[PDB]
Structures are given as C-alpha cells and as structure tokens.
Design a protein around this ligand. Structure first.
Ligand SMILES: *CC(=O)NCCC1CCN(C(=O)C2(Nc3ccc(Cl)cc3)CCOCC2)CC1
Ligand SMILES: *CC(=O)NCCC1CCN(C(=O)C2(Nc3ccc(Cl)cc3)CCOCC2)CC1
Ligand SMILES: [Mg+2]
Ligand SMILES: [Mg+2]
Ligand SMILES: [Mg+2]
Ligand SMILES: [Mg+2]
Ligand SMILES: [Mg+2]
Ligand SMILES: [Mg+2]
Lengths: 236, 5, 236, 5
C-alpha cells in the first residue's frame, strides 16, 4: 500500500496531525498504514483508528441519509419523474460507504482481533466489528441482509460476554459497547424493548459502581452514562 | 438519531 | 475524464444533490465534468461551480493554516526536534491545494473566460481567477511568488475595470469582487490602506444606489455590504 | 480571517 514506505511512528504522528487539521480521510489512511505494519496497537493508537474511521463513515452515512430521503420522496405519488440520477448518486455514495466498512472489517480480520488477548483490546475490536457490520446493515436490501445483521449481532454479543466477565460496569469500553449494541437493537434488529432494557440495566449497574472511581474516571464514565440516558429519553 | 460512540 | 460519459444535465443535477449532501468534492467533480462539455455556463451553473471549489479549497486552506502554525511553533527556540513529519504533511496538504487551484485555473483558461462576453459572466470568471491565484499566493515561498501575486492582481484589476463600466454599484458580483480584491490588498499585497479605501468606497457607492432596488435585490446587496463593513471593522 | 465570497 501507499503507506508501506513510511515508518510506523511517523504514520501515528501524522494521524495525530490530521486529527488536529480535521482531515479524517488522511487520518484513516495513516492509521490503516500503521495497522498494516503488523504490530499490535496501543490504547492511544486504537482510539486514533476508531476516531478516524468513525468520522469518515459518519460523513458518508449522513450523506446517504440525505440522498435516500430525496430518493424516497421521488417514489411518492404525484412526484415528477426525474430519471436515474438520484438513485445513481445514492448508489455511488453507498458503494463508497460499503468500501470503507469493508476496509475496516478487513483490518479487524487481518489480524487485529486474533492477536487481541487483553479484554480492553478484544472488546474494543469486537465492538468495532459490530459497528461496521451495523453500518453495512443500514444500507442492505438484498439476499445477505439477514446474514449482515447476524454478523453485527454476533460480534456485539461476543464483546458483551467478555466485557461482563472481565471489566467493571463503569469501564468506558463496556459502556460504549452497551450503548452501541442497544442502538443496534432499536434501529437494526427491530427490538426496541431489548434496546431499552440494555440501556437501563447498563446505566443502573454503572451508577452502583461509580463510588469506586477517581474524579477523572468518574468524569469519563458519567459522560457515556449520559448518552445512555439521552437515548432512553428519546425512546420512552 | 441516537447516540453512539 | 471520468465524467465524459455522463450527460451535462445529469452532471448538473448531481452537483445539486451533492450540495444538499454537503459532498463538495463530488460537487466539484460533477461541475468540472459539466464545464468540460464545452458549452457556456448559465448563471445558476456558474454559482454551482464556484460554491463547489470554494468549499473544497476552503477546507484545504483551513488545514494548511493549522499545519503551518504547528510547523512554525516547531521552529521556535526551545522546541524539541520531532523530525520531518510536520513539514512533510504540510507539504502534502499544500500540494493537494495547489492541485485544486491549478484545476480551477485550467477550467477558466480552457475555455470559460475567452467565451464569456457578458459582463456578469466575464467579471465572475476573472474574479475566480484572482481568487485561485490568491490561494496559490498564500502558500508561495519561491522564485515565482511575485509573478503569482501579480497574476492575481491582474485578474482582479481586469474584473474591476469591466465591473465599473458595465454594472451598477449594488450588483452582487461587483460587490463580491471588490470585497475579495480588498482582502487581496490587505493579506497578500501588503497594502492595508488600499484595502480599506476600496472597501469604504465600494460600500459608500453601493449605499447611494440602494434606492433603485427592489426588496429582494436590496437584501442581496446589503448582505455583501455588511461583509465589507465587517472587514472594515476588523481593520480599523 | 476576513470575509470573502
Ligand atoms: C485503553 C482504552 O480504553 N482505549 C480505547 C477506549 C477509550 C476510547 C475513548 N473513550 C471515551 O470515553 C470516548 N469514546 C469512546 C468510548 C468508548 C468506546 Cl468503546 C469507544 C469510544 C467517549 C465518547 O467521547 C469520546 C471519548 C475512553 C475509552
Ligand atoms: C447571474 C449571477 O449573478 N450569477 C453568479 C453570481 C451570484 C452568486 C451568488 N450571490 C451572492 O450574493 C452570494 N455569493 C457570491 C456573491 C458574489 C460573488 Cl462574485 C460570488 C459569490 C453572496 C454570499 O453568500 C452567498 C451568495 C449572488 C450573485
Ligand atoms: Mg520501521
Ligand atoms: Mg447498492
Ligand atoms: Mg440481559
Ligand atoms: Mg449530451
Ligand atoms: Mg511546496
Ligand atoms: Mg480607486
């Protein structure tokens, strides 16, 4: 790849610069290069990887939703026929989104997950696997849609099982996993009751463990707890 | 749209 | 080019979709394809072209400024040596910026300007020529920097001469040209007094012609007049 | 940074 000639440390340095410049496509490309060096990622480096791709795919998802809405409006009664362009451009954006998701899934499969033995790393990568299958599921309409949804579920569930055994209920990775899996249940799996139950139980179990935390850890955990509360408020 | 991290 | 097989009208349709989706790189690529069909652009189409590239280069300029500031801080006394990475990445962004500017200048030279006979189109394109040479000047440090600055000046000046002869003082293109040429004087040409004089004279001449305008034209002209006032406030 | 259009 195009980053093969760049030092690992330089790729990481440049990813941090790209983040400061809000150049998330560049950030993602630097981080992909760093992963492809073959060494395990540190905590900081896992965060860089995730931030980069979250921001790239986030932008693509927002664009896809704009275009999908326009396309849906075009298919209503009384809408004038404007030709294939809206579908074509929605497809273009969709294909680019799918490409990014496939790139991330590829990094996780070759070989981040299999080398991840500590709970913090393994849960984090399995959560990411769930997230990128979820993004594929958002745009899926064909023969494989059920298998894509099941791939997301399986990844999230493996992450949940490890997190419950190995991490305290306030751990930010455990909380973030639960937040996202709850959204999977609500938005993808047509399971709003499961979504609500998971968010409520996660919040309550975290609340009960806050007493163990330093001020700084408390700030980190409570930030994500508020996201759980925000979703619960949206859904109830 | 709901919050994710 | 990659848009050679797409209908002109479809390119324009897709540029409008890309704008709605805030996909400005795509918007610019569609508009480049439309220009390369060889037909003159309408008013609406000239606006699409300009919006697309303004947004792409705007993002690149903001990133370049972040990276340049980091690089400058690295060259201060007492700053630890961190190697070539900041310079390299600033150069990467700079080269991409220069590429976009060269693409726009190329469209203007082949053959938008030479076919533009009406004042509205010719002034608009010459203003754009000035703007993209100005962006090149912002990053120039070599043998050609003076010639790049002079290219911007010459384009702006030709636009100003036509605008003063052919357009009323409230015309938004005339106002926008003056706004940008004033910024050229202040930021590029080291001529803050010229910048201030131009902004003041342009504002005052516009004010005196507002009485001729409809409500809708008044709204358009006064918006840009306020930008002139905003710059004057910054500079005095 | 000053306003341009
Ligand atoms: C060692 C380690 O834990 N590294 C990676 C996990 C970090 C990521 C950043 N953290 C956060 O609390 C925020 N993002 C986030 C949380 C949890 C997950 Cl699984 C992913 C991302 C929370 C949301 O705002 C940004 C930071 C701490 C844990
Ligand atoms: C026929 C015609 O005049 N077409 C192009 C010029 C338009 C552009 C949009 N207009 C504006 O007033 C705004 N942008 C802008 C003004 C002037 C120039 Cl030279 C370039 C762009 C003003 C800033 O906010 C966005 C619209 C009207 C004239
Ligand atoms: Mg090495
Ligand atoms: Mg498709
Ligand atoms: Mg349960
Ligand atoms: Mg044709
Ligand atoms: Mg250079
Ligand atoms: Mg004068």
């Amino acid at each position: 790849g195009a980053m093969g000639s760049m030092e690992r440390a330089s790729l990481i340095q440049k990813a941090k610069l790209a983040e400061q410049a809000e150049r998330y496509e560049d950030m993602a490309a630097f981080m992909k290069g760093a992963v492809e060096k073959g060494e395990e990622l540190s905590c900081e480096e896992r965060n860089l990887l995730s931030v980069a791709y979250k921001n790239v795919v986030g932008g693509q998802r927002a664009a896809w939703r704009v275009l999908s809405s326009i396309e849906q409006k075009s298919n209503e009664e009384g809408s004038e026929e404007k030709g294939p362009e809206v579908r074509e451009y929605r497809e273009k954006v969709e294909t680019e989104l799918q490409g990014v998701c496939d790139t991330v899934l590829g990094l996780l499969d070759s070989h981040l997950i299999k080398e991840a033995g500590d709970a913090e790393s393994r849960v984090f990568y399995l959560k990411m696997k769930g997230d990128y299958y979820r993004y594929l599921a958002e745009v899926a309409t064909g023969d494989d849609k059920k298998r894509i949804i099941d791939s997301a579920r399986s990844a999230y569930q493996e992450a949940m099982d490890i997190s419950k055994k190995e991490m305290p209920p306030t751990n930010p990775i455990r909380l973030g996993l639960a937040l996202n899996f709850s959204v999977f249940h609500y938005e993808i799996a047509n399971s709003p009751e499961e979504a609500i139950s998971l968010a409520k139980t996660t919040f309550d179990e975290a609340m009960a463990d806050l007493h163990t935390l330093s001020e700084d850890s408390y700030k980190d955990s409570t930030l994500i707890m508020q996201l759980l509360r925000d979703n619960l408020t949206l859904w109830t | 749209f709901p919050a994710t991290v």
